[model samples]
Target: TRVIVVGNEKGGAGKSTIAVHLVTALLYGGAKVAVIDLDLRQRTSARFFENRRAWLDNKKIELPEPLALNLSDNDVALAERPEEEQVAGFEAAFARAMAECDFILIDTPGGDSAITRMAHGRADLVVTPMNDSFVDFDMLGTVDPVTLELTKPSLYSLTVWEGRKQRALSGQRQAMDWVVLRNRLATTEARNRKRLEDRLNALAKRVGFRIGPGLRDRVIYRELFPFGLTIADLSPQVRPVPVSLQHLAARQELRALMHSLGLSAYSGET
Candidate 1:
């Protein structure tokens, strides 16, 4: 199974959004996907699937759903337990997902934690989504104050670096692929965006991550959240909201994302 970990050190970076959308897209393409939400406090991805189940059942609409794996029955209690117990719980879930699914997508919390690092260690692909601004960029790298040039990698980069090292030491033949997504693109900030792009490009070369396209800040992305729907789930019969040209563009954007990950073969032609 290919393990894809969606993570970022900062919150509001659209990690859950990307995780849910990727899960739905893979499911629609007929791949067995299992999801593990490591954000014990928020459980955004886990709750999203629950919402999806309820919405689909009420509407009598058939939609693809991922196997939502949890560390415990009561995640709050799980969080209270010792780190060893939590790691063990995560390993059990990971093993089951590896056995049962074609792809395992893990949505990590927006901070550093043992469980999050463990997930990163096992990832075949690590996807880090950052908003298209220096605020978001701060986690992955730091910039020189005088010239605002990328100085070096930062905390989150070190986390991935350790993960990659561990993967190598474990005798995993294939190297892990890390992709940094430039998410929530804004149309108004041309000059600022260009500056961020240059630094991002520099960091990519420095840290060995491919930069990928991320979804735009569109209302359609937000409107479908309550329904636990992504652009992939929209159809004539499954319309929870009005479809528009922007939705089509969003779908294309998702396709491009899949293509960038080299998983386009699994994203069946529509």
Candidate 2:
């Protein structure tokens, strides 16, 4: 099974949002997907799947659901448990998903943890999303004080590098692919955008990550959150809210994202 981990060391980077979308897209494409939400406290992705199942059942709609894999019933209890227990729980869930699913998508917490590192180490692809600004960029790479040129990869990059190194040494199936997504790009910051673009490209080259198009700040993306629906799930039968031209564009954006990640074949028409 393909293990895709959506992660970043910073919060509010749209990690869960991307994870949910990818899970649904793959489900729509006829892939049996299992989702492991490693953000034990938040469990945003897990909650989304619950909402999806309820909404679909209530509305008599038939949409594919992901195999929701959780470490425990109560997140707080799991958090208070021993580290060894937490690792064991995750390993059990992971092994189950790998045995039964075509793809296992793991949504990680915004901060580092033992379980997060374990997920990263098992990833076939790592999707890192960052807001399109230097603030978000700081987590992945550092820049010079005056010139603002990218100086070196930062903590998160080093984390992925270590995972890649371990994967290679283990002679695993294949080297992990890392893709950084620049999300929520501002409309009126051409100057800032250009500077960010240059530095992002430089850092990508330095860290061996591919840059991918991310979902823009669109109302459509947020509006569907309550229903646990993505653009891929929108249709005449599944319209929980009114659709518009913006929704169409959002679907295109999602398609572009899947294409950039080399999962175009795994996404059916949205």
Candidate 3:
């Protein structure tokens, strides 16, 4: 089974949003997918699945939904638990997911923790989303104030590198692909976008990660979240809210992302 983890060290990076869409797309493409919400307190991914279940029940609409694991505690802290217990909990969930899922998508907390690192180590792909601004870029690496040149990798980038290192040390020969996605891009900031593009180009090669197109800052996502739907879920009979022409474009953006991840069954270009 392939493990895909979506996370970053900061909140509001659209991690859970991306996670749900990935699960939806994979299920729609005829894959048996399972999801683990590592953000035990927030349960963002779990709640999204719950919302999906509720929507399906209420609307009597059949769309692909993944088997979601229930998290019992509001505060399940790996650090508070014994090391053996931590590993046991993680392994139990890991084994269950790998046993039944072709793809195991894990949505993690915005902050770092033992559980986060554990998830990262198991990931075949790690997606880190950031807003198209210097504020979010700081999570991956620092930039010089005047020169705007990347100084060095910061917290999250190093953490992922360490996870890859640990995976190799554990004799998992497969390499993990890390992709930094720019989320919530503005439509009008040519100069700002150009600067971000230049910095991202420089940083991608420096940090050994790839850049992928991300969902734009659209009102459609906000409108659909409560119903646990994505732009791809928009249809004639199931139009929860009215969609504009841009929503069609958002669906294409999602397909681009799926192809970028090599999950091309639905991309139709493979």
Candidate 4:
């Protein structure tokens, strides 16, 4: 199974949101998919799929349920478990889901952790989302204050680079597809956006990550979260909320993301 780990070191980087949308989109597109949420405290992905189950039951709609699980270290001491044990725990969970699924999407908590590190090493694709601000950019690279130029790769970027090198050494996993997604993009801010774009392009070449489209700060994405639904899941019959042209745009945007990841084609054509 192809493992896609949605990760970033800072919180509010929209990791869980991007993950769930990818999972649901793949499911609706007829791929057998499974998910493992590693954020023990938040359990955002786990709860989202659970919410999907409840919503389907309430609506009396029968839909195929994708396999899903949650993994956590639970604040246990790392010395007690050992790194091998920690990595093994993640592998064990992945193996279960991988057996029956064509794709596996893992949602990791923001920041460094044993679970996050190992998951990255296993990933076929690592998607990191950052907001349209330099504050979010700091997670990938530092910028010179006066020159507005990228100085060096940041902590999270280095962590991912390590994962890539180790994966190459093992010669097991596929060449890592590291993508940096620009989430919460602004419609305005032309000048600031240009600078951010230039720096991102430079860093992408240096750090081996390609930039891609990410969801905007849309009310619809937030609105559908409680129901555990994505824009791809909405239809005239299934929409538990309002529909608009923007919803259509959002669905197509999601399709573009899948296409970029080599997950699915433009299904809207058929």
- 1 or 2, which is superior by TM-score? 2
Candidate 1: tens digits of C-alpha lDDT, residues 1-270: 899999988756777888898898788789999999988888889888988999989988777889999888887678778889889889999999999999999999877889998889888999988778876778888877556556777777899999889878888458999998777666538667677777778777777789998887788878888888877877777788876776878788788888898888887522
Q: Over 4 Å off in model 4, which ranges?
A: 72-89, 145-150, 266-270
lDDT tens digits, residue span 1-270, model 3: 889999988757677888888888888788889998877767788888888899989989888888787433432454366555655666777788888989999888877777788888889999887777777788889877667566888777888999888877888458898887777566537667777777777778777789887777677877888898877677776678865675877788788888788777742211
* Model 4 Cα lDDT, one tens digit per residue, 5-90: 89887756667878888887777777788998877667788788888899998999866557886444452343255666667767
Q: Using lDDT as the measure, what is the rank order of every candidate, best first?
A: 2, 1, 3, 4
User: What would the TM-score be for candidate 1 when compared with the true structure?
Assistant: 0.93
Candidate 3 residues lying further than 4 Å off, grouped into runs, are 73-88, 145-150, 266-270
On the 0 to 100 scale, the lDDT of residue 149 in model 3 is: 66
Residue 160, candidate 2: how far off, in angstroms? 0.5
Which of the two, 2 or 4, has more TM-score? 2
Candidate 1 lDDT: 0.84
**TM-score, candidate number 3:** 0.88
Candidate 1 vs candidate 3: which has greater lDDT?
Answer: 1
* Pairs of residues clashing in candidate 3: none
The count of residue-pair clashes in candidate 3 stands at: 0
Per-prediction count of colliding residue pairs? 0, 0, 0, 0
Alpha-carbon TM-score of each model against the true structure: 0.93, 0.94, 0.88, 0.88
lDDT of candidate 2 over 225-269, digit per residue (tens): 889888788877888887677777767778888999999998884
